[PDB]
CSV table of C-alpha atoms and ligand atoms in Angstrom, one decimal:
chain,number,residue,atom,x,y,z
A,1,UNK,CA,-118.1,18.0,173.1
A,2,UNK,CA,-120.8,16.4,175.5
A,3,UNK,CA,-123.2,19.3,175.4
A,4,UNK,CA,-123.7,22.4,173.3
A,5,UNK,CA,-122.6,24.3,176.4
A,6,UNK,CA,-119.1,22.6,176.3
A,7,UNK,CA,-118.7,22.9,172.5
A,8,UNK,CA,-115.8,25.2,171.6
A,9,UNK,CA,-117.3,28.0,169.5
A,10,UNK,CA,-114.0,29.8,169.3
A,11,UNK,CA,-112.2,27.2,167.1
A,12,UNK,CA,-112.8,25.6,163.7
A,13,UNK,CA,-114.4,22.2,163.5
A,14,UNK,CA,-114.5,19.2,161.2
A,15,UNK,CA,-117.7,17.9,159.5
A,16,UNK,CA,-118.2,15.1,162.0
A,17,UNK,CA,-118.0,17.6,164.9
A,18,UNK,CA,-120.6,19.9,163.3
A,19,UNK,CA,-123.0,17.0,162.5
A,20,UNK,CA,-122.6,15.8,166.1
A,21,UNK,CA,-123.4,19.3,167.3
A,22,UNK,CA,-126.6,19.3,165.4
A,23,UNK,CA,-127.8,16.2,167.2
A,24,UNK,CA,-126.8,17.6,170.6
A,25,UNK,CA,-128.8,20.8,169.9
A,26,UNK,CA,-132.0,18.9,168.9
A,27,UNK,CA,-131.7,16.7,172.0
A,28,UNK,CA,-131.4,19.7,174.3
A,29,UNK,CA,-134.2,21.8,172.7
A,30,UNK,CA,-136.6,19.3,171.0
A,31,UNK,CA,-139.6,21.6,171.3
A,32,UNK,CA,-137.8,24.3,169.2
A,33,UNK,CA,-135.5,22.6,166.7
A,34,UNK,CA,-135.6,19.7,164.4
A,35,UNK,CA,-133.1,18.3,161.9
A,36,UNK,CA,-134.3,17.7,158.4
A,37,UNK,CA,-132.4,15.8,155.7
A,38,UNK,CA,-133.1,17.5,152.4
A,39,UNK,CA,-130.8,15.4,150.2
A,40,UNK,CA,-127.4,13.7,149.9
A,41,UNK,CA,-124.3,15.1,148.4
A,42,UNK,CA,-122.4,13.8,145.4
A,43,UNK,CA,-120.2,11.7,147.7
A,44,UNK,CA,-123.3,10.5,149.6
A,45,UNK,CA,-123.1,12.6,152.7
A,46,UNK,CA,-126.4,13.8,154.3
A,47,UNK,CA,-127.4,17.4,153.7
A,48,UNK,CA,-129.0,18.7,156.8
A,49,UNK,CA,-131.1,21.7,157.6
A,50,UNK,CA,-132.1,22.8,161.1
A,51,UNK,CA,-135.7,24.0,161.5
A,52,UNK,CA,-136.4,26.4,164.3
A,53,UNK,CA,-140.1,26.8,165.0
A,54,UNK,CA,-142.6,27.3,167.8
A,55,UNK,CA,-145.4,25.7,166.0
A,56,UNK,CA,-147.9,26.6,163.4
A,57,UNK,CA,-148.4,25.0,160.0
A,58,UNK,CA,-146.2,26.2,157.2
A,59,UNK,CA,-145.6,29.5,158.9
A,60,UNK,CA,-143.8,32.1,156.7
A,61,UNK,CA,-140.1,31.3,156.8
A,62,UNK,CA,-136.6,32.6,156.6
A,63,UNK,CA,-133.9,30.6,154.8
A,64,UNK,CA,-130.2,31.0,155.8
A,65,UNK,CA,-127.4,29.0,154.1
A,66,UNK,CA,-123.7,29.0,154.9
A,67,UNK,CA,-120.7,27.2,153.5
A,68,UNK,CA,-121.7,26.9,149.8
A,69,UNK,CA,-118.0,27.7,149.1
A,70,UNK,CA,-116.2,25.2,151.3
A,71,UNK,CA,-113.0,27.2,152.0
A,72,UNK,CA,-115.0,30.1,153.6
A,73,UNK,CA,-114.6,28.5,157.0
A,74,UNK,CA,-115.8,31.6,159.0
A,75,UNK,CA,-119.3,30.9,157.5
A,76,UNK,CA,-119.8,27.3,158.9
A,77,UNK,CA,-118.3,28.6,162.2
A,78,UNK,CA,-120.8,31.4,162.2
A,79,UNK,CA,-123.7,29.0,161.4
A,80,UNK,CA,-122.9,26.8,164.5
A,81,UNK,CA,-122.8,30.0,166.7
A,82,UNK,CA,-126.2,31.2,165.2
A,83,UNK,CA,-127.8,27.8,165.9
A,84,UNK,CA,-126.9,28.0,169.5
A,85,UNK,CA,-127.8,31.7,169.7
A,86,UNK,CA,-131.4,31.0,168.5
A,87,UNK,CA,-131.9,28.6,171.4
A,88,UNK,CA,-130.4,31.0,173.9
A,89,UNK,CA,-132.3,34.2,172.9
A,90,UNK,CA,-135.8,32.8,172.4
A,91,UNK,CA,-137.7,34.0,175.5
A,92,UNK,CA,-134.9,36.5,176.5
A,93,UNK,CA,-134.6,38.9,173.6
A,94,UNK,CA,-138.0,40.5,173.0
A,95,UNK,CA,-137.4,41.1,169.3
A,96,UNK,CA,-136.1,37.6,168.4
A,97,UNK,CA,-138.9,36.1,170.5
A,98,UNK,CA,-141.5,37.9,168.4
A,99,UNK,CA,-139.9,36.6,165.2
A,100,UNK,CA,-139.9,33.0,166.2
A,101,UNK,CA,-143.4,33.2,167.7
A,102,UNK,CA,-144.6,34.1,164.1
A,103,UNK,CA,-142.0,32.7,161.7
A,104,UNK,CA,-139.9,29.6,161.1
A,105,UNK,CA,-136.1,29.7,160.4
A,106,UNK,CA,-134.3,27.1,158.3
A,107,UNK,CA,-130.5,27.1,158.8
A,108,UNK,CA,-128.2,25.1,156.5
A,109,UNK,CA,-124.7,25.2,158.2
A,110,UNK,CA,-122.8,23.1,155.7
A,111,UNK,CA,-124.3,23.6,152.2
A,112,UNK,CA,-121.3,21.9,150.5
A,113,UNK,CA,-120.3,19.0,152.7
A,114,UNK,CA,-118.0,17.2,150.2
A,115,UNK,CA,-116.0,20.4,149.6
A,116,UNK,CA,-115.8,21.0,153.3
A,117,UNK,CA,-114.4,17.5,154.0
A,118,UNK,CA,-111.9,18.1,151.2
A,119,UNK,CA,-110.7,21.3,152.8
A,120,UNK,CA,-109.8,19.3,155.9
A,121,UNK,CA,-108.3,16.3,154.2
A,122,UNK,CA,-106.4,17.6,151.1
A,123,UNK,CA,-106.7,21.3,150.1
A,124,UNK,CA,-107.7,24.0,152.5
A,125,UNK,CA,-108.5,26.4,149.6
A,126,UNK,CA,-111.0,24.2,147.7
A,127,UNK,CA,-114.2,26.1,147.0
A,128,UNK,CA,-116.2,23.9,144.5
A,129,UNK,CA,-118.3,20.8,144.9
A,130,UNK,CA,-116.6,17.4,144.2
A,131,UNK,CA,-118.8,16.2,141.3
A,132,UNK,CA,-116.9,14.6,138.4
A,133,UNK,CA,-117.7,15.2,134.7
A,134,UNK,CA,-116.6,12.8,132.0
A,135,UNK,CA,-115.1,15.3,129.6
A,136,UNK,CA,-112.4,16.4,132.1
A,137,UNK,CA,-110.0,15.3,134.8
A,138,UNK,CA,-111.0,18.5,136.7
A,139,UNK,CA,-113.5,18.1,139.5
A,140,UNK,CA,-116.3,20.2,140.9
A,141,UNK,CA,-118.7,23.1,140.1
A,142,UNK,CA,-118.9,26.5,141.7
A,143,UNK,CA,-122.3,25.9,143.4
A,144,UNK,CA,-123.0,29.7,143.5
A,145,UNK,CA,-122.9,29.8,139.7
A,146,UNK,CA,-125.2,26.8,139.2
A,147,UNK,CA,-128.6,28.3,139.9
A,148,UNK,CA,-131.3,29.0,137.3
A,149,UNK,CA,-130.8,32.8,137.2
A,150,UNK,CA,-129.0,34.0,134.1
A,151,UNK,CA,-127.4,30.5,134.0
A,152,UNK,CA,-124.3,30.4,131.8
A,153,UNK,CA,-124.2,34.1,131.0
A,154,UNK,CA,-121.2,36.3,131.5
A,155,UNK,CA,-119.6,36.1,135.0
A,156,UNK,CA,-119.2,32.4,135.1
A,157,UNK,CA,-116.9,30.0,133.2
A,158,UNK,CA,-117.8,27.1,130.9
A,159,UNK,CA,-114.4,25.4,131.6
A,160,UNK,CA,-114.7,22.5,134.0
A,161,UNK,CA,-111.2,23.3,135.4
A,162,UNK,CA,-112.1,26.9,136.3
A,163,UNK,CA,-112.7,27.9,139.9
A,164,UNK,CA,-115.9,29.5,138.7
A,165,UNK,CA,-117.2,26.7,136.5
A,166,UNK,CA,-121.0,26.9,136.3
A,167,UNK,CA,-121.6,23.1,135.6
A,168,UNK,CA,-123.3,21.4,132.7
A,169,UNK,CA,-126.8,22.8,133.2
A,170,UNK,CA,-128.7,24.8,135.8
A,171,UNK,CA,-129.3,22.8,139.0
A,172,UNK,CA,-126.9,20.0,137.9
A,173,UNK,CA,-125.4,19.9,141.4
A,174,UNK,CA,-127.5,17.9,143.9
A,175,UNK,CA,-126.4,20.3,146.6
A,176,UNK,CA,-128.2,23.1,144.7
A,177,UNK,CA,-131.2,21.1,143.4
A,178,UNK,CA,-131.9,19.9,147.0
A,179,UNK,CA,-132.4,23.5,148.1
A,180,UNK,CA,-134.4,24.4,145.1
A,181,UNK,CA,-136.9,21.6,145.5
A,182,UNK,CA,-137.2,22.2,149.2
A,183,UNK,CA,-137.9,25.9,148.8
A,184,UNK,CA,-140.4,25.4,145.9
A,185,UNK,CA,-142.3,22.7,147.7
A,186,UNK,CA,-142.5,24.8,150.9
A,187,UNK,CA,-143.8,27.8,149.0
A,188,UNK,CA,-143.9,30.3,151.9
A,189,UNK,CA,-140.3,31.6,152.3
A,190,UNK,CA,-140.2,35.4,152.8
A,191,UNK,CA,-136.4,35.9,153.1
A,192,UNK,CA,-133.4,34.1,151.7
A,193,UNK,CA,-129.9,34.8,153.1
A,194,UNK,CA,-126.7,33.2,151.7
A,195,UNK,CA,-123.5,33.7,153.7
A,196,UNK,CA,-120.0,33.9,152.3
A,197,UNK,CA,-116.6,35.3,152.9
A,198,UNK,CA,-114.6,37.5,152.5
A,199,UNK,CA,-114.8,41.2,151.7
A,200,UNK,CA,-117.3,42.8,154.2
A,201,UNK,CA,-120.2,43.3,151.7
A,202,UNK,CA,-124.0,43.1,152.0
A,203,UNK,CA,-125.5,42.6,148.5
A,204,UNK,CA,-128.9,42.4,146.9
A,205,UNK,CA,-129.9,41.3,143.4
A,206,UNK,CA,-129.0,41.2,140.6
A,207,UNK,CA,-125.6,39.9,139.6
A,208,UNK,CA,-126.5,38.5,136.2
A,209,UNK,CA,-128.2,41.6,134.6
A,210,UNK,CA,-127.9,45.4,134.8
A,211,UNK,CA,-131.7,45.6,135.2
A,212,UNK,CA,-132.7,47.2,138.6
A,213,UNK,CA,-135.0,45.2,140.8
A,214,UNK,CA,-138.4,46.7,141.4
A,215,UNK,CA,-137.9,46.6,145.2
A,216,UNK,CA,-134.5,48.5,145.0
A,217,UNK,CA,-135.5,51.4,147.3
A,218,UNK,CA,-136.7,49.1,150.0
A,219,UNK,CA,-133.9,46.6,149.8
A,220,UNK,CA,-131.3,49.4,149.8
A,221,UNK,CA,-132.7,50.9,152.9
A,222,UNK,CA,-132.9,47.5,154.7
A,223,UNK,CA,-129.2,46.9,153.7
A,224,UNK,CA,-128.2,50.4,155.1
A,225,UNK,CA,-130.0,49.7,158.3
A,226,UNK,CA,-128.4,46.2,158.6
A,227,UNK,CA,-124.9,47.5,158.0
A,228,UNK,CA,-125.3,50.2,160.6
A,229,UNK,CA,-126.4,47.6,163.2
A,230,UNK,CA,-123.5,45.3,162.4
A,231,UNK,CA,-121.0,48.1,162.6
A,232,UNK,CA,-122.3,49.1,166.1
A,233,UNK,CA,-120.4,46.3,168.0
A,234,UNK,CA,-116.8,46.4,166.8
A,235,UNK,CA,-116.7,49.1,164.1
A,236,UNK,CA,-116.5,46.7,161.2
A,237,UNK,CA,-117.3,48.6,158.0
A,238,UNK,CA,-119.4,47.0,155.2
A,239,UNK,CA,-120.4,48.3,151.8
A,240,UNK,CA,-123.8,47.5,150.3
A,241,UNK,CA,-125.5,47.5,146.9
A,242,UNK,CA,-126.5,45.3,144.1
A,243,UNK,CA,-124.1,42.5,143.1
A,244,UNK,CA,-123.4,43.8,139.6
A,245,UNK,CA,-122.7,47.4,140.7
A,246,UNK,CA,-120.7,46.6,143.8
A,247,UNK,CA,-118.5,43.8,142.5
A,248,UNK,CA,-119.0,42.7,138.9
A,249,UNK,CA,-121.4,40.6,136.8
A,250,UNK,CA,-121.8,37.1,138.2
A,251,UNK,CA,-124.4,34.7,136.8
A,252,UNK,CA,-126.2,31.7,138.3
A,253,UNK,CA,-126.2,33.0,141.8
A,254,UNK,CA,-128.6,31.9,144.5
A,255,UNK,CA,-130.1,35.2,145.6
A,256,UNK,CA,-130.9,36.1,142.0
A,257,UNK,CA,-132.8,32.8,141.7
A,258,UNK,CA,-134.6,33.3,145.0
A,259,UNK,CA,-135.7,36.9,144.2
A,260,UNK,CA,-137.1,35.7,140.9
A,261,UNK,CA,-139.2,33.1,142.8
A,262,UNK,CA,-140.9,36.0,144.6
A,263,UNK,CA,-138.7,35.9,147.8
A,264,UNK,CA,-138.3,39.6,148.1
A,265,UNK,CA,-135.8,39.8,151.0
A,266,UNK,CA,-132.9,38.1,149.2
A,267,UNK,CA,-129.4,39.1,150.4
A,268,UNK,CA,-125.8,37.8,150.4
A,269,UNK,CA,-123.4,38.6,153.1
A,270,UNK,CA,-119.6,38.4,152.5
A,271,UNK,CA,-118.1,38.4,156.0
A,272,UNK,CA,-114.7,39.4,157.4
A,273,UNK,CA,-112.0,40.4,156.6
A,274,UNK,CA,-110.9,42.7,153.7
A,275,UNK,CA,-107.8,40.7,152.8
A,276,UNK,CA,-105.3,40.7,155.6
A,277,UNK,CA,-106.1,37.0,156.4
A,278,UNK,CA,-108.8,36.4,153.7
A,279,UNK,CA,-110.1,32.8,153.9
A,280,UNK,CA,-107.6,31.9,156.7
A,281,UNK,CA,-109.3,34.2,159.3
A,282,UNK,CA,-107.8,33.4,162.7
A,283,UNK,CA,-110.0,31.5,165.1
A,284,UNK,CA,-109.8,34.4,167.6
A,285,UNK,CA,-112.1,36.3,165.2
A,286,UNK,CA,-114.9,33.7,165.0
A,287,UNK,CA,-117.0,34.9,167.9
A,288,UNK,CA,-116.7,38.7,167.2
A,289,UNK,CA,-117.6,38.0,163.5
A,290,UNK,CA,-120.6,35.9,164.5
A,291,UNK,CA,-121.9,38.4,167.1
A,292,UNK,CA,-121.8,41.4,164.7
A,293,UNK,CA,-123.2,39.4,161.8
A,294,UNK,CA,-126.2,38.4,164.0
A,295,UNK,CA,-127.1,42.0,164.5
A,296,UNK,CA,-127.2,42.5,160.7
A,297,UNK,CA,-129.3,39.3,160.1
A,298,UNK,CA,-131.7,40.2,163.0
A,299,UNK,CA,-132.3,43.6,161.4
A,300,UNK,CA,-133.3,41.9,158.2
A,301,UNK,CA,-135.6,39.4,160.0
A,302,UNK,CA,-137.3,42.2,161.9
A,303,UNK,CA,-138.1,44.0,158.6
A,304,UNK,CA,-139.5,40.7,157.2
A,305,UNK,CA,-141.9,40.1,160.1
A,306,UNK,CA,-143.4,43.5,159.8
A,307,UNK,CA,-143.5,43.7,156.0
B,1,ZN,ZN1,-118.3,32.5,148.6
């Protein structure tokens, strides 16, 4: 509400409330966080990233995006909690302090703002963007099938009405191209984390091909360590592995694209639960989910600073 200390982190919020939160956080911690506009959505809403930094010039960086699939409301709620947590733990947690003293963090809480507004207004289960194509009355693209990584291959649909429609061409969705351009221009991202729900999975590349990545041994051990840290708070059990061996072939996904740009520490989290509530996770689970997920993310960031 009036301060980030009176904001209710244990309930779900609207787009306007999350955008107001971002401005409160910047006003309270102007030496540590800044708000960047990296584009505008199809319906003209600003696309914002929060940059957390203690200085430097183009320091090596960590990317985290949440909410690319709009109905996965636990992810935007986790992103708000993360933003606050960064500002609380800098100078208090020795390990997070060391990360931010050497690296920058870029956090995109609402990666698909038009879908998110639609889930509040019209259809709680909407997952796609809201772009319109002329050959159909169906709306929207699955923005996690629109990236230039095996685009249009098996594990995505070419039908505009499908929930897994990949779009007309790679990077057709402005929500995806805004990220692509920003990461390419920056050139010094070391980790790329995309957060989803549900199923309790920690995945590494690839989804579009059976080929094993050259860094499989290391990314598998980092994933094991991150799942063990996450489980330590409440006992939540995650599985881990490559996308294609753990779930199924899926093309056009963001961490396949980021790994092929040379961003070695590329992971997707699928948060709680395993299906009892699914996308309609009760608000009473927001803070426990965020707290345990933070331990998993911090484990990946520690490995990145030292490697
Ligand atoms: Zn998702």
